[PDB]
Amino acid sequence: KGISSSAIPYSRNAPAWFKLSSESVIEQIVKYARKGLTPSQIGVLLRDAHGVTQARVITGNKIMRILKSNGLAPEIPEDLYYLIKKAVSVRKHLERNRKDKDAKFRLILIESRIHRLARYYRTVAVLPPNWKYE
Amino acid sequence: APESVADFERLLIGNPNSSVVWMNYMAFQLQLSEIEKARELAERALKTINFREEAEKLNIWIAMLNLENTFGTEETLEEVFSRACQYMDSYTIHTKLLGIYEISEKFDKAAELFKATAKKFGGEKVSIWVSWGDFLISHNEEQEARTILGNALKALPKRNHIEVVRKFAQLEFAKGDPERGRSLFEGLVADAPKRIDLWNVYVDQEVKAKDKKKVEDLFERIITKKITRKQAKFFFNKWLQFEESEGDEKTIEYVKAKATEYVAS
Amino acid sequence: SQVFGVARIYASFNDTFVHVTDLSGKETIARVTGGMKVKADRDESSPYAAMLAAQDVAAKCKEVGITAVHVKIRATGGTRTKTPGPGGQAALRALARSGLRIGRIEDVTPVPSDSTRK
Amino acid sequence: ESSFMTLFPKYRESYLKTIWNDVTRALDKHNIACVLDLVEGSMTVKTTRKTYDPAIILKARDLIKLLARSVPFPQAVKILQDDMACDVIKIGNFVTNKERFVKRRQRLVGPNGNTLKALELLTKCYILVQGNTVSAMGPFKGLKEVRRVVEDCMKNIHPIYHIKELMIKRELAKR
RNA sequence: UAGGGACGGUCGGGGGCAUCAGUAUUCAAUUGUCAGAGGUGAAAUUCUUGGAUUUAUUGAAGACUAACUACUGCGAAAGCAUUUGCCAAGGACGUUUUCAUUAAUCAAGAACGAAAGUUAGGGGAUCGAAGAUGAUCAGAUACCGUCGUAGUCUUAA
């Protein structure tokens, strides 16, 4: 296992070269999010093109809260959603070449990693019970 | 029943994974002159079926393949087999393609499918040998059938080639040549000289093909042969049952006489 | 001025072959395989048998007309020893000593190229 | 006219530079020339006009590839006489897993080298187990015996069975 | 400088399917030539004047991936080396992307496979593939139900 992540600066301030408005960020966020784009992609595009550092610093609060306050919420959280679609992609690939045992083993891993944050989200009650992995 | 593009979709709310009902609805749409909605139903049957249940997806693939072999196209049957390969093991998918070709009565496509089996699965195991024997037996050339079976048995291992030879002899007793069946039976009893598993196979195949004077005499030789009391009494009782089915009471008694001769030593 | 055969000598263990075809290889001339000049059934791979076979090979090559020989020396190859036996040196030494000109040494032993033993 | 060539690994050049004059004296007695290139890392050997033994280019080829395959010069020069030849046994394609392969190869080497040294004494050969092959110099009976002991050592049977039966066959051929 | 997820350029002989290539080996056909050729410490069984062995031209088969190949790589392990394409996957790194404790260790249970059956004597009580018996379906040796051989039991290789 390796140390590969991001290093948030010591500053909680606006970067002082950032002349752009502290509301048009939120309008750009809701533009991308209601043209249908996941929050990690919102944050990275807002970083790359309309360059913000991260929007929790420049706006009031973090962007999943911005989407929830702008009425733009996800049905299912993002991590669980991508793990669901990876599990169903490898399941379609398995119901295909029934001899990829290796993919069978890693389906065991992906489902065992579904259940961890699924029961986390149940105990926090983000998405409700009577959600039993289809 | 559910046999349309509206009523089937409305009535399939209870069992979406209905493989046989989806196949019947697709065949009813194709008889109802809707090949597009028929193929849509045949493709969405495996999608409305579960993911881990591979047999339902293979059944939907066989349904689309049968619809393509009846009133479709060979490209759709190959998609159905690629679909079969996308629903199951590739050798079973190609064997389903060979079965659809045999149902569509294409002799050249059946021989090409048996050859594509007899290369890969022919070097793997003996199922391609059985498929080649089936194709050439339906083509009525038992010489070419035995040659392809021996070639595939040389390509595959020879430890199951004894049971393959016994199956070839039983098939030859069923729908081939009886002298060739008896010759393959003698070859199998030679390759298994220590096992009477070929002797009882030869006796059962001859009694099934109504060779009573063959089956009861060979089983009497096996019962009076180098066998134990149980191994003698089983073969002698089978030979006596075959001799009483033919109508030979004194021969059925002499079978038990040879059993009593071999059990006491 | 020289006319060329090709030696195609084969120095296996347990035997040596001298088999001098024409330049294509389709038409053979003067095969005198070792184990026939002198045979104790052991000395068939010996340098003495190889030089006897090469000397009467060169006799028949001179009576046909071949004055020079491209020589191809082949070991037993395959999934086996791959090195030439005792007779491969002695055969072409005797072919050179007995008046016949030698050209183009090359090894055409069958290197098996990822062979079959499992 | 004939020419052969091997190319040798870089770490051998300080040794081959030392023994190269002795190579030139051991091949100029057979009237055959040879260069070694230090910038491409090769050893080529050419038949000159003054060469009357045609088979000696093959033994010179075997000599320079033995100098490639790392066998000492006074060990290597014995190719130049007639009752001596090379063999390169291939051992890598017998067994699957690395653990059993290196254990059977170390079994071919021996505890303290005793199996390999006793095999050299019995077969009258020079044997180098190296990497995933086994090189050998010797007479042809010794090459035949070393090929059968190595190819049967990669199968399960212990090579000291072959050392025992070689001692039995020597003192059983001494009558 | 806990954990998870996204992205990016990738990395690998990780896996599955399909494709392609290689030269050996074996067999067959066609010649050329003749008496021997395997194999061994010697021999022998075997192959052989409807011509072997060798040589040349092919064709077919089943494998296998020579060197390059390394105290190198990948995989959870067993293990994995030809090309190309597809299918998903994985890891390290980069990150001023996202969630916010979602975490660590191991009692049952499983997919895996390195993971097995080399020849012979003997007991068969049970079970029993192979073989056969009646209905299901345009099509059913499986399904249901039995007779029944080796084997399932043992000993050395």
Side-chain angles (χ1 to χ4, degrees), chain A, chain B residues 1-2 6 14 16 27 38 42 45 55 63 72 84 99 110-111 116 118 122-123 133 145 150 152 155 157 169 174 176 178 181 187 190 192-193 209 232 247 257 259 264, chain C, chain D:
Chain A
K1 290 175 94 288
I3 45 168
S4 179
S5 67
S6 65
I8 304 301
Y10 190 79
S11 66
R12 293 177 178 178
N13 280 312
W17 57 266
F18 185 75
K19 301 285 102 174
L20 193 145
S21 177
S22 175
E23 183 67 28
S24 66
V25 176
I26 296 99
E27 272 101 13
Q28 186 64 257
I29 287 170
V30 301
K31 278 173 91 286
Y32 287 115
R34 76 177 64 253
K35 75 178 74 174
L37 198 65
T38 194
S40 299
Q41 196 65 247
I42 309 300
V44 68
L45 286 176
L46 266 291
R47 182 183 72 193
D48 292 330
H50 300 87
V52 302
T53 59
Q54 66 268 18
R56 188 178 65 247
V57 176
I58 296 172
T59 71
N61 48 8
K62 56 177 69 67
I63 63 172
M64 185 175 285
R65 183 66 183 271
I66 293 173
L67 268 63
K68 185 173 72 69
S69 66
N70 287 317
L72 198 56
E75 182 188 5
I76 187 166
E78 185 179 4
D79 308 335
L80 185 62
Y81 174 72
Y82 280 107
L83 288 172
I84 284 294
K85 68 182 289 184
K86 186 183 287 185
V88 73
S89 178
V90 71
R91 186 175 293 169
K92 186 178 262 77
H93 167 80
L94 197 152
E95 65 83 17
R96 177 176 284 100
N97 44 38
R98 300 175 61 33
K99 288 184 281 187
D100 197 359
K101 298 71 176 305
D102 184 76
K104 189 255 185 64
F105 179 76
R106 284 183 170 92
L107 180 61
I108 301 170
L109 265 64
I110 292 169
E111 291 182 354
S112 174
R113 195 168 64 246
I114 287 288
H115 291 166
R116 294 289 187 92
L117 87 164
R119 71 190 180 184
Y120 170 69
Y121 284 151
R122 261 87 58 84
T123 57
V124 180
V126 176
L127 86 169
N130 194 0
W131 186 78
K132 298 283 102 174
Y133 179 68
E134 70 181 1
Chain C
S1 179
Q2 298 296 108
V3 58
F4 291 94
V6 54
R8 302 290 177 87
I9 54 174
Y10 172 69
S12 179
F13 287 173
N14 298 322
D15 207 354
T16 304
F17 293 57
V18 182
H19 180 268
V20 179
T21 66
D22 57 354
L23 194 63
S24 67
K26 184 73 165 63
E27 180 72 29
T28 183
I29 292 166
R31 182 177 63 245
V32 54
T33 58
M36 111 86 178
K37 294 299 291 183
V38 57
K39 56 181 182 180
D41 210 4
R42 296 185 300 273
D43 296 331
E44 48 181 4
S45 66
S46 65
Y48 180 70
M51 65 89 72
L52 288 174
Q55 282 181 358
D56 58 351
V57 157
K60 192 174 286 292
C61 290
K62 288 185 285 185
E63 80 179 3
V64 171
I66 292 170
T67 62
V69 165
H70 300 97
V71 47
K72 292 171 71 174
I73 171 66
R74 175 172 176 259
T76 188
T79 179
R80 286 185 288 113
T81 310
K82 198 182 263 76
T83 182
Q89 47 168 348
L92 65 93
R93 284 192 180 101
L95 290 173
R97 184 65 61 85
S98 61
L100 191 64
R101 188 180 292 272
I102 298 299
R104 298 292 181 185
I105 310 287
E106 63 183 0
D107 285 330
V108 290
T109 177
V111 53
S113 169
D114 65 34
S115 65
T116 167
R117 71 174 66 249
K118 291 190 288 185
Chain D
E1 181 68 28
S2 179
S3 178
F4 287 98
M5 177 178 172
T6 194
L7 79 180
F8 61 94
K10 181 67 176 175
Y11 57 88
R12 296 295 316 284
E13 66 177 0
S14 67
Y15 166 29
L16 294 177
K17 184 178 178 181
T18 300
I19 57 99
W20 186 254
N21 292 320
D22 293 333
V23 176
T24 60
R25 86 83 157 97
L27 289 176
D28 285 332
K29 65 177 70 175
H30 292 90
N31 296 115
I32 190 164
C34 56
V35 316
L36 92 165
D37 177 339
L38 278 301
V39 301
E40 80 185 3
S42 68
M43 289 182 283
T44 195
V45 48
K46 295 182 263 74
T47 295
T48 184
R49 185 78 274 278
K50 291 177 69 68
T51 300
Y52 60 93
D53 194 1
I56 204 63
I57 185 64
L58 294 172
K59 287 179 174 294
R61 190 267 312 277
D62 293 332
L63 177 65
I64 49 94
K65 63 167 64 177
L66 281 176
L67 269 61
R69 298 295 295 166
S70 72
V71 288
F73 178 78
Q75 182 58 253
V77 294
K78 291 184 283 187
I79 294 297
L80 275 302
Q81 63 262 18
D82 295 332
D83 197 0
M84 191 74 71
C86 297
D87 195 357
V88 180
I89 318 296
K90 187 181 185 296
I91 67 175
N93 54 2
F94 283 99
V95 75
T96 62
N97 48 357
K98 181 179 73 176
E99 182 181 2
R100 191 181 298 169
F101 179 68
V102 302
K103 287 179 100 294
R104 292 181 184 179
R105 192 182 68 237
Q106 188 66 42
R107 182 179 295 164
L108 182 59
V109 175
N112 209 166
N114 287 124
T115 301
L116 187 61
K117 180 62 71 176
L119 187 63
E120 289 175 353
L121 290 175
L122 289 170
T123 63
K124 297 289 287 184
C125 290
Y126 186 109
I127 306 162
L128 287 180
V129 177
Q130 53 181 357
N132 52 6
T133 188
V134 175
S135 180
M137 289 178 64
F140 294 95
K141 296 181 178 67
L143 265 60
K144 193 172 183 178
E145 291 175 353
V146 72
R147 177 170 287 275
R148 64 171 58 89
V149 64
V150 172
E151 293 180 354
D152 293 332
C153 180
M154 291 303 162
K155 294 180 283 293
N156 276 315
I157 54 99
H158 205 192
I160 56 97
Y161 286 89
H162 278 87
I163 276 96
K164 179 65 182 293
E165 75 178 3
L166 282 174
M167 295 192 296
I168 292 298
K169 286 191 286 184
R170 292 295 187 272
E171 194 62 30
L172 192 60
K174 289 299 290 184
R175 62 184 70 186

